[PDB]
Each structure stands twice: as structure tokens, then as C-alpha cells.
Write a protein that binds this ligand. Structure first.
Ligand SMILES: *[C@@H]1O[C@H](CO)[C@@H](O[C@@H]2O[C@H](CO)[C@@H](O[C@@H]3O[C@H](CO[C@H]4O[C@H](CO)[C@@H](O)[C@H](O)[C@@H]4O)[C@@H](O)[C@H](O[C@H]4O[C@H](CO)[C@@H](O)[C@H](O)[C@@H]4O)[C@@H]3O)[C@H](O)[C@H]2NC(C)=O)[C@H](O)[C@H]1NC(C)=O
Ligand SMILES: *[C@@H]1O[C@H](CO)[C@@H](O[C@@H]2O[C@H](CO)[C@@H](O)[C@H](O)[C@H]2NC(C)=O)[C@H](O)[C@H]1NC(C)=O
Lengths: 141, 116
């Protein structure tokens, strides 16, 4: 005979995002508050740190900045809106997205109009399969 | 009435049972196996007395498989139990699964301050 037990559970992959200060993302930033003028660029990369790195590709899908730390603020300045670079700002440049364990991009600095002095960054992340589905962005126009 | 536990960690899954095994059903020794026989159990005394196995959450370390949805990703293996090398009256097994979502919300914890 056989006496079968079926259990369940769940967990999450750890995933992180960090800023950088070079051409090739040499020196990441560790401080808690960054003071840089609007002549300086914002080189930003993401990273997949959990596991199963052999199978899942890291695709950036929605990367936006907001003047408040709370992620659901209605004021959003978009950088990547739907899996594609925003082409209005003529300085945004995306180098790698959807091909490895890290997504990287580059914009120039801004400050929101009105009575605001802080800028926070937020991103959403989709994990696309390297073996089942095409993951590199196709974007024109 | 056999209290199990599950810990679907970031890199590895873990199924563990307590030492009421020595009092339940007369299990004098504990043999614990996975779908691949080379993965076996060990002893765990960190908080209470536990007996556990360890599997990575990938495709084929200890014969775990990836069953994937469009919203989740679920790994699974099957554990085996006995009190002797040969089973004669009860083929006991415990089927487990850990699911993983594919849609993350990561935010940069540090803030900025520009000078115009
Ligand atoms: C994409 O893939 C993911 C990964 O599998 C799916 O997410 C899981 O969906 C299933 C199906 O709803 C969830 O399973 C659980 O089903 C139980 C009902 O079925 C059992 O119980 C009846 C008797 O009631 C039996 O006859 C039957 O044979 C089954 O054994 C529910 O009871 C569960 O609710 C549980 O919720 C949580 C679990 O952590 C606890 O509070 C309780 O234990 C409670 O019982 C549940 O509905 C499973 O949980 C989902 N996993 C998740 C969300 O991580 C997606 O549904 C799928 N998407 C698709 C197909 O579109
Ligand atoms: C983020 O900010 C909003 C308001 O700016 C906080 O309030 C929520 O507002 C939404 C609609 O915008 C409502 O649906 C929620 O019910 C509101 N929640 C509460 C608790 O009032 C929201 O709480 C903030 N998020 C935090 C603090 O995590």
C-alpha cells in the first residue's frame, strides 16, 4: 500500500538594484543620500541575486522615478514604459536588457517642477525564459 | 498527525521532520531518500531535534523538475521514508512543491538630491 501526503509552500528570488559612476559601472554607490548636479549622469543597473541563473533572463519592464518614497505616488517620470526606452528625452540610452542576470541603462539627471526636493527610483521586473520565449526587446519608433 | 515543515529558500528547498518519529510508528532508525538515491538525509539540532533533506531549486540536482506557469514557477520532488532498508508493509512518501512568482517589485533604497 501507500500513504501519500501532499504539502505546499512558496518563496521568492532575491533581486536588487544599485547605482554606478563610470562608463562600465565600475564603482557602485553605497551611501544613503546622493548629491550630484544636473550635469551628471545616472548610470543604473539591476541584478538577479537569488538563483536559477542558468534558465531565467532578467527583463526590465517599467522603470520610473517619483518624487516620493511611497511607490504608489501618482507623479511618475517614466524611463522604460512598456519594455522599451522612452524616446522623448534625447539622452536616455539602454545598453543591455533581457539578455543576462543584469539590466543596465543610463539617463541624465532631473528635478521635478514645483515644491519637491527628493527623487526616488522604482522598477518592475519580469523573468523571461531563455529556452521558451524570445526575450530581447524589439523596439522602433 | 506527523508534523512536517517546509522552507522554500532563495536557493534551496528543505523538508524536515521531528523526533517524534522515534515515538510514532516505531521508527527506530530513519532512512530518508529523494528521487535520486544519492541525496539523503542528515540530522538537525539547531532549534529542536529535526531530521531533514536538502535540495537545490534547479532542474535536475536531485531529480527535481520545473513545472512552470505564466505567473509562477513550481519545483517538486518526492521524499521516501522507512524504518529499515526494505519496505514490507507501508511505502510511505511525502510529496512536496515550492512555487516561485515571476513578477518582482524592486526599488532603489537610496535617494537623490540634485542642484539646478
Ligand atoms: C499558475 O500556477 C500557479 C502555481 O501552481 C497556480 O497557483 C496555485 O493555484 C492552486 C489552484 O488554485 C492553489 O492551490 C490550492 O488549492 C486548494 C483547493 O484544492 C485542494 O483542496 C480540495 C479540498 O478543498 C481538494 O479536493 C483538492 O484535491 C485540492 O487538494 C485550496 O484550498 C488552496 O487554498 C490554500 O491557500 C493557502 C495556500 O498557501 C492557505 O491559506 C491554505 O492552505 C488554503 O487551503 C489553494 O487554492 C495554489 O495555492 C496556488 N499557488 C500559489 C498561489 O502560490 C496558479 O493558479 C496558476 N494560474 C493559472 C492556472 O491561471
Ligand atoms: C502611498 O500613498 C497613498 C496616498 O498617496 C496612501 O494612501 C492610499 O491611497 C490609495 C489611493 O491612492 C488608497 O486606495 C489606499 O486605501 C490608501 N491607503 C491608506 C492606508 O490610506 C498609501 O497608504 C501609501 N502607501 C504606503 C504608506 O505604503
Amino acid at each position: 500500500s501507500a500513504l501519500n501526503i501532499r504539502v505546499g509552500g512558496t518563496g521568492m528570488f532575491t533581486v536588487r538594484m544599485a547605482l554606478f559612476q563610470t562608463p562600465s559601472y565600475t564603482q557602485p554607490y553605497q551611501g544613503s543620500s546622493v548629491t550630484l548636479s544636473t550635469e551628471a549622469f545616472l548610470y543604473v543597473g539591476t541584478m538577479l541575486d537569488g538563483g536559477d541563473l542558468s534558465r531565467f533572463a532578467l527583463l526590465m519592464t517599467n522603470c520610473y522615478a517619483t518624487p516620493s518614497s511611497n511607490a504608489t505616488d501618482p507623479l511618475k517620470y517614466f524611463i522604460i514604459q512598456d519594455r522599451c526606452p522612452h524616446t522623448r528625452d534625447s539622452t536616455i540610452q539602454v545598453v543591455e536588457n533581457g539578455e543576462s542576470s543584469q539590466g543596465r541603462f543610463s539617463v541624465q539627471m532631473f528635478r521635478f517642477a514645483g515644491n519637491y526636493d527628493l527623487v526616488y527610483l522604482h522598477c518592475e521586473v519580469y523573468l523571461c525564459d531563455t529556452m521558451n520565449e524570445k526575450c530581447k526587446p524589439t523596439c522602433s519608433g
